[PDB]
Amino acid sequence: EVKLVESGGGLVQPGGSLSLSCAASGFTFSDYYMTWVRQAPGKAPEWLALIRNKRNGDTAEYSASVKGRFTISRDYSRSILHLQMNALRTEDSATYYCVRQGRGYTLDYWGQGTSVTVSSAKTTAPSVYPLAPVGSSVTLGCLVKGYFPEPVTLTWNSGSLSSGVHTFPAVLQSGLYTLSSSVTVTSSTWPSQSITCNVAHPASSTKVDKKIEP
Amino acid sequence: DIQMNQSPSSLSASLGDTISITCRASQNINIWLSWYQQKPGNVPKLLIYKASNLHTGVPSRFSGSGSGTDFTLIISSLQPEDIATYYCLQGQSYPRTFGGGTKLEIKRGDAAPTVSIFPPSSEQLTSGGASVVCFLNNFYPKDINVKWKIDGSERQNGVLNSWTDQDSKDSTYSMSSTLTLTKDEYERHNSYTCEATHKTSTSPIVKSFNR
Ligand SMILES: N[C@H]1[C@@H](O[C@H]2[C@@H](O[C@H]3[C@@H](O[C@@H]4[C@@H](O)[C@@H](O[C@@H]5[C@H](O)[C@@H](O[C@@H]6[C@H](O)[C@@H](O[C@H]7[C@@H]([C@H](O)CO)O[C@@](O)(C(=O)O)C[C@H]7O[C@]7(C(=O)O)C[C@@H](O)[C@@H](O)[C@@H]([C@H](O)CO)O7)O[C@H]([C@@H](O)CO)[C@H]6OP(=O)(O)O)O[C@H]([C@@H](O)CO[C@H]6O[C@H]([C@@H](O)CO)[C@@H](O)[C@H](O)[C@@H]6O)[C@H]5OP(=O)(O)O)O[C@H](CO[C@H]5O[C@H](CO)[C@H](O)[C@H](O)[C@H]5O)[C@H]4O)O[C@H](CO)[C@@H](O)[C@@H]3O)O[C@H](CO)[C@@H](O)[C@@H]2O)O[C@H](CO)[C@@H](O)[C@@H]1O
Questions:
Q1: CA–CA separation, B3 vs A2, rounded Å?
Q2: Alpha carbon A97 to chain centroid, angstroms
Q3: Number of CB pairs < 8 Å for A and B?
Q4: CATH class of B1-108
Q5: Set of chain A residues whose Cβ sits within 8 Å of the Cβ of B84
Q6: Smallest Cα–Cα separation from A107: which of A192, A182, A181, A4?
Q7: CATH class of B109-211
């Protein structure tokens, strides 16, 4: 299976720089032109750069929005695609994707993406608050406040509890995000069995577990 | 630069319906036109390349047609999993350009929200804040409003709302509403209530607790 794994994203101040990397596997890397495409939330994807392969000199093309500020490159020794980003602005915040061009000028396989936030707001770890109820089924929750930047990853029982969950998009207020999640189970499931909110925040290298108690 | 214009920008259709989405290029692009589906929270995935060719693994319910400037994606027999934004992409010229997308929403019967209210956690109060949370879950249509009241009075400031995208299994929507106060402001009042206005009731559904 074709796989593209981006890394290097994170929070950077306006005016700063970042270097993204993309590890390719599952195809002959040298046979494909490669690209970077980004997507801001609720906007269409925006293509940023393409690099050809050795026959064409590893030559490249850029969108006007990044030409002169971003540089695409590729390392055949490790099958890694890179994007160096300079002079970043708040409008440069998005999920960045490593994307292969296949035959016929199609962008055929996209990575998972790496999140980039350009902001002068500082990294802060989240507070995680358990939300226990005040017949039949019961809804419990987890409130995550006080953090920056996105993303957090929220699971229930370390990912073992995935049904009945609603994890709400994070909302920004005054430089701090709030996120929440509800989980609905049978009243015979809880409190007799343990239900715990886990919140990972890579930007602060924090993983918080909060058991919901009566 | 080649502008890709997609139509309609949003569509609501019934399960089992045939739908038809359009992409028009501002210049000839021959057959270099691909279509993508992006399910909520997911990355874009290729459906059709070279205008009309089905990508490996993409249900035969999807098909594409067109050449030159005007292209169409058909989805036969709409399934709940098809909730997504669809985008086209031209690969004729640089810069590579995408259409602005068509957001697909699935029609379904009305469903009232299941509403749950949560007083501040003792951890939060220890640290000095007091958030009260209401979840309004699994409802349809998407249109909803929430009103907070403290001892019977409308509170507006301090409220943070978030909504999920459409659920790909039951085609419902959910919302969370968090009212944040100081611990001291919270302790000056007793009654906390959230009220949801929705199609499914002529009067607000309310949930309440008394500190
Ligand atoms: N060019 C173009 C354009 O023009 C424009 C521009 O100009 C600019 C620029 O230039 C340039 C660029 O563009 C680029 O180009 C490239 C070329 O053209 C080509 O190439 C190719 C490749 O390399 C290969 O291919 C082949 C194969 C392989 O081999 C296999 O492995 O593959 C295939 O098959 C596939 O895959 O498909 C293809 C093939 O090819 C062919 C054949 O058949 O062969 C040919 C071609 O042409 C075509 O036709 C194709 C189709 O599509 C089909 O038909 O085919 O190889 C080849 C050979 O060699 C081999 O024998 C070559 O050729 P040539 O002729 O050149 O030799 O082509 C490319 C692309 O298009 C392709 O695509 C395809 O493929 C891909 C891959 O796979 C490849 O590998 C994929 O990805 C896709 O999807 C598809 O499929 C082009 O690119 P683009 O980007 O454009 O697109 O580059 C160049 C460089 O390179 C060159 O040179 C070098 C040195 O330097 C060396 O010599 C080399 O060899 C060569 O090639 C460049 O030059 O840029 C420059 C710089 O900067 C400048 O100066 C110029 O000016 O632009 C302008 C402004 O805007 C304008 O004016 C112009 O016009 O376009 C046009 C119109 O459209 C046209 O006509 C032209 O051609």
A1: 30
A2: 10
A3: 133
A4: mainly beta
A5: none
A6: A4
A7: mainly beta
